[PDB]
């Protein structure tokens, strides 16, 4: 974990003082003595497995290319931009993900490397919702698929997911989508960017069959203790089914 | 850990029971031992008897006090402490007289028993003392009017029991009622009485003072300075002790505003001088306690001068400005015209300049800038006033001498007075908080109310006479001031006891001949020690101490299989602690039972900067030792238990393999702390090595000796016109 | 290779959400990503062998007591939580959470965990507590409550710090193992 | 500060006690703070210090404990006994060697050897002091010379240093590099004595009576010391005690 690495690096050094605004550098520190540093885990950009562009690639192949032969890196920046409603965190979330283009690709001759070039981004909560929910969906895809090939499996993380998704309990994500984007007030803040909210509608639409594999594989892997779980799951599940049909107004598939 | 000798051949008695000596084992609960003893004396009802040492204690054996059962100490079985408490409720409060008196002598002897005190305070028999000597005083009035010697003895033993049960505090201090202080007052207010009554009554006076400030106020009306003196006049030493202790208490808990008043009343009723003439040079003895009492009297006068010492009063206030003007007039007018007494501001500046460049004052816009540093400020002014009343001779002559010299030989009178007063205040402990620690007393202070002030005047007199004997200047004003302070020290070590003796000693110290005597004493104290060579040795000290420190630091690096909180059951009594050459990271903690000790890796407690480290506490100072539950370790690892502070929640509550390495580690950590060491090994090795080292320096000079004192400097040709050039 | 269930509950004014999300996210203190979903997970090597684990991050309101026991079986450990700077949290836990969670899975290792250690010693905050008669209750009586249950362990962290937070989860995982 | 003179009669630039740093190169001098002076002014002396033989030290003449000569003892005849104070001065230099050598020792903990080092050192220094006069008779000078050379070589064998040579009267006559083969054989003899001494140290570390006969191979006249006190009994009559040695 991050600060175990931070410890090991401070070991390496005297003057064990850390920068704290982990994202940006410090100009005074560009010249001042008393060596500074800052540590923060970053995101290993996915590879581009050649010749695998669409093929029915298994899991091991993808997981191996997931971490290695990497030369791009991002780091997602929580940042408030807009009005800071108390009930929600999403009204302002703007992510200035930082691009990390280094010289070579891990693994390498050296367990580390410099960066050759950096840049940033800027992400709307519209988009934020888009890809965050999206990646959530394929995470569901991962769990369903991994128990679609494996059988002698601990079905427990499936319960993790189905619980956490089924009730956005401490915080209701889906109504948050509705209020933040589906509501026409946003389509006066971002009228032309209804092009975005319709994508999110498409996303929850595609979510529906995806959560449907979640449900059916739960039922296949349902055990008696999973039963109360699954009854609430299926209840709220065809609930959200009709929600996407009409209440979300998304065209299902 | 291991228990002491439990199998102990002790005598076991009961008053009237012939002892039978077995091999008692102390492990079983004391109910069983008392059971076998009582059955041996055919006694049932075991809970109503508790063994007690037949020692002079008469203290009942409970579980708290049976590790005092040593081979040969007779055990005297008797009533258990609760039974003794109940016996005392019925034979301390009752209407019998002889039974009360003897039972109360018992209760006085037995109050020191904490084991008895538990249940007696649960019984609240000190309230029963309240009834027996405040109610009981008016039940037997008709004939106690004639029994008053015996009745006063009874009430004195009541006082003994009251104080020796109040000290426990498990019962609150205010258990007495107001009639208790009425009786104590009748003891202190009235004429002379029995020694025991007056003794314990003054004791209880100072006890209520100790209890609370409200109790102080309510006892003050019964303790009058006019009536507190005959107790001193009560020639017995102890009556004097307690009356002076009450004097100190009245000084202590009074507000400072009333403290000045009571210092004045001490002055007028002769308390200073009368205690001098009753104890100090009289036929009565100065104990350690009398030393404390006289010391706190003098220090209380001192700290009521401290009210003008500590603070920074106005330098430019018009009232103090005018009073220093009248002081400087009665001082300087022997060399001033009558015009400058009330001259204009411009003339004030002019006379400042003329008359204070004769006194080397840097800030001549106001001489109060020589009184703007406190202590004393205004009490240097008070010293000037006292001289105007008592020592205007020394005042005037010292002023005129320095009022006739622009040159640097001058005595800067505002400056000299301020700094003389402040130095003799620190040296003489003028204005300090009274504490029993300092256990001397100066009779010279008790020979005069303002002997502080005459001390200051005589030291200015000796200062300037020795300047005219030591041609002293004001660049040496600090130097020759330290010379005068040395004179004061060579007086005080001889302990002048009055005004005349202080005069004689200081004059004999006035660089006439005894210099050769005291530097001969210095020659004697170098003859086995080589004092100039001591200067040599300790001059470059830090090398050896620093190398010792990094030595021991290396030792921390190579460390040991350290020991833990109760590292006993499959626990790592052995865990490594390797400092990395970082000297900021310590590799230690819950490390396995290590044969070779230190494997250098990220130890289970891998980090330890000096940064989190505040300090270390050793042994019983360890809060895990001060932990009274699951972390109850036995105290023999005192020399092994430390506790270093970091994050104020995680401690280094850990045990050492033995003592000297514990000391070495603590030395290294203090070196990280940048302080002294705490191995005696450290001092021993450092002294022997540096001594031998400097002995390894004499190799050059020997077979011819050293001029110990510094020779003069043979003069040079100031130019660098080298006849033979350098290089 | 193996996995471990665990639940976390606490007062709703503190959002232990932030705790878990910042931990598994591993991101900078006070800079974590706030999500739209609960019930977080972590795949961590603790000692020797890596282990997966997922944390039933549940809503704590009492009317949600009717859904929570359905997941009570096979809760490998539990993480009961509060806020140090919130005596109200003390009341909540001692009176409702502690009792009924003790009832519900009486035989499973339990560790109480502090919160807002940084806020526990915020002088402005604690002076507000005094001007609202809230007590800036410290560790030792918190440990005393731990002894009140005799919990298998107790700790505190702080989200704006991650102090002990790693260690919090360290003892958390190694309690099972 | 001027009027300095080219001479070698200030190589006794020798401190007496502490000084101050009034000059550019001054300080509180130690005892053995010798400065190898060349610039000779009357009241003040400046020349290369022993500690820094590339820098001077300007020090008052009375503060100087000047003696006539150089660091030598026999050219100006500063020997209290001719020629052997050269030995004691080289001894002093050796002592300064032991000084630093132990001033690296403490970091290791072998320091019982450190101890015996200083105890041998105390032997050496008290011998230094006794020879600082013309005290001993000259045969005793010879014997103790052999002893002190023994200690010197013992240290240097401990301390991975050289072999010193020329046991008698100087240790340094031989390294005048005049002969050559004599140098080899003297090195040889010194090696012999070193090996004998290390053997005897590791042997008296174990044995305590073979050493006696090793001493007594040469001498064979001895005296068994007898001291009688009292025959414990009442003889009741005059008696005579006949103590003779008998060989069954």
Residue numbers in the entry:
A (entry chain B): 1390 to 1642
B (entry chain A): 1 to 727
C (entry chain C): 1 to 177
D (entry chain B): 1 to 248
Copy text from the publication.
The dedicator of cytokinesis (DOCK)/engulfment and cell motility (ELMO) complex serves as a guanine nucleotide exchange factor (GEF) for the GTPase Rac. RhoG, another GTPase, activates the ELMO-DOCK-Rac pathway during engulfment and migration. The DOCK-A (DOCK1/2/5) and DOCK-B (DOCK3/4) subfamilies specifically activate Rac and have an Src homology domain at their N-terminus; the Src homology domain is involved in autoinhibition and binding to engulfment and cell motility (ELMO) scaffold proteins. ELMO is structurally divided into two domains: an N-terminal domain (NTD), consisting of the Ras-binding (RBD), ELMO inhibitory (EID), and ELMO domains, and a C-terminal domain (CTD), consisting of the Pleckstrin homology (PH) domain and proline-rich region.
The components used in this analysis included DOCK5ΔC, ELMO1FL, RhoGQ61L, and the nucleotide-deficient Rac1G15A mutant (GTPase domain, residues 1−177). From this partial map, we reconstructed the entire RhoG/DOCK5/ELMO1/Rac1 complex at 4.7 Å resolution with an ordered RhoG-ELMO1NTD. In the RhoG-bound DOCK5ΔC/ELMO1FL/Rac1G15A complex, a curved dimer formed, with RhoG located at both protomer tips. Rac1 interacted with the DHR-2 domain of DOCK5 and the PH domain of ELMO1 near the dimer interface, akin to the prior DOCK5ΔC/ELMO1FL/Rac1G15A ternary complex. Notably, ELMO1NTD was disordered in the previous ternary structure. However, in the present RhoG-bound structure, the α-solenoid of ELMO1NTD arched toward the DHR-1 domain of DOCK5 and bound to RhoG in cooperation with the C2 domain of DOCK5. Due to this binding mode, the ELMO1NTD of the RhoG/DOCK5/ELMO1/Rac1 complex had a compact, open conformation that was different from the elongated (S-shaped) open conformation of the DOCK2/ELMO1/Rac1 complex. In the present RhoG/DOCK5/ELMO1/Rac1 structure, the C-terminus of RhoG, Pro181, near the lipidation site, is adjacent to the phosphatidylinositol (3,4,5)-trisphosphate binding site of DOCK5, which includes basic residues such as Lys457, Lys460, and Lys464. Four membrane-binding sites (two DHR-1 and two RhoG) were aligned in the same direction in the dimeric configuration. Thus, the present structure suggests that RhoG and the symmetric DOCK5/ELMO1 dimer can simultaneously bind to the plasma membrane.
